Design a protein around this ligand. Structure first.
Ligand SMILES: N[C@@H](CCC(=O)N[C@@H](CS(=O)(=O)O)C(=O)NCC(=O)O)C(=O)O
Ligand SMILES: N[C@@H](CCC(=O)N[C@@H](CS(=O)(=O)O)C(=O)NCC(=O)O)C(=O)O
Lengths: 221, 221
């Protein structure tokens, strides 16, 4: 088989979505966590990071970097990418929106303190007035269990991850989205997913004051 | 046939890559430029923007938003997406790097003036020490005319666009990349491309002081 190797920080960051997808597909993976700048420098010095950056995943003889490129490969490989062109268009559109909101939430735990209140307010507004209504719309338009093609695809996993982050952010934001709540529960019950959600998995925890200061300098000046 | 409708600002922004790809595929398109905030508000109020944002392209009965989702659909549809999974992995990896550098360059014409010198310096360093060497590497590894699969794909177009932007930024940065220069000339000579590069096409010009202040407020508060 050959167990994929994921190179990234001991953190969610951009690698988390990939971890989720792989776990969802029931594919066991090995991780090589960069603990120090020296490690990152070693990685780069090894010439396997196309743009001297991570995520980077070794799979099928390739040293694939670029989050989306990685997700994209895994999705097709395990058949979590729908059944055709139009389905993929929807999948892509939904996924991109998910990523955007994700980053938006991340920014919150990074923005210059004196400006937090406002940013939080915007992220919440956007969350409940722009994003959630959209996914709820999709779910409502067809009444089916999956977002696209009435079959499990990567976006279902992507949507789940985001909802979990929204729940950590502020759980009251999800209470006016019944279909999304039901969806969340459904996807969370999928064996592979349930397992990933269980403790002792490679699922990373949210960034903390100590494991945050390091990554700033470690970035590699 | 049905000519695709592209909704965006009378500017490059995120829509430019899509314009390039379509032109490259020889697909004529119609554009609906948002000139004022009222126009943007009308667009949103019309309920055809999934996340109340543009790019948004009407094609094949879909109101497809999200740059990458759009590019992705067009690439597969016109066969500018390679021949398989591994090819697509390379295509994706390369494309993402191209986008990153692109944004980096954009930021330059947006960053708070007092900080420009430094940012410019970083972008130049990255351009010549991280990005160009990478593409030059690819070209060097196989000696072929195209980046991937020895056949025209979306990345070739993507690479061209970026090189043109690099040339506008600082043309001396490309002189130490012979294969890239030869590549640039080659892709620019492709009929559809040559046409797009010719005046009177839908190719947008670089943002200017007047057509920049508007887009800030127009963003839609
Ligand atoms: N577009 C890339 C972005 C990767 C990226 O930004 N990598 C950063 C770290 S992080 O932002 O993801 O945390 C990096 O390795 N930078 C190191 C360097 O530039 O020296 C992707 O999505 O894969
Ligand atoms: N991830 C989206 C980003 C789209 C986006 O940011 N759209 C902005 C304008 S721009 O940044 O591309 O210029 C927008 O329409 N914002 C309007 C609003 O949010 O009200 C994509 O790539 O399609």
């Amino acid at each position: 088989s050959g167990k994929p190797v994921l190179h990234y920080f001991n953190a969610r960051g951009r690698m988390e979505c990939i971890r989720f997808l792989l776990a969802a597909a029931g594919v066991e993976f090995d991780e090589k966590f960069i603990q120090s700048p020296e490690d990152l420098e070693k990685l780069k010095k090894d010439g396997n990071l196309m743009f001297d950056q991570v995520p980077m995943v070794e799979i099928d003889g390739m040293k694939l970097a670029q989050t989306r490129a990685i997700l994209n490969y895994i999705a097709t490989k395990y058949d979590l990418y729908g059944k055709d062109m139009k389905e993929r268009a929807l999948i892509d559109m939904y996924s991109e929106g998910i990523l955007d909101l994700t980053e938006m939430i991340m920014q919150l735990v990074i923005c210059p303190p004196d400006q937090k209140e406002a940013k939080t307010a915007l992220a919440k507004d956007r969350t409940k007035n722009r994003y959630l209504p959209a996914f709820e719309k999709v779910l409502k338009s067809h009444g089916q269990d999956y977002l696209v093609g009435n079959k499990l695809t990567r976006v279902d996993i992507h949507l789940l991850e985001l909802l979990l982050y929204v729940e950590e952010f502020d759980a009251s934001l999800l209470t006016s989205f019944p279909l999304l709540k039901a969806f969340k529960s459904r996807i969370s019950s999928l064996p592979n997913v349930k397992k990933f959600l269980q403790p002792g998995s490679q699922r990373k925890l949210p960034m903390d004051a100590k494991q945050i200061e390091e990554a700033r300098k470690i970035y590699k000046f």
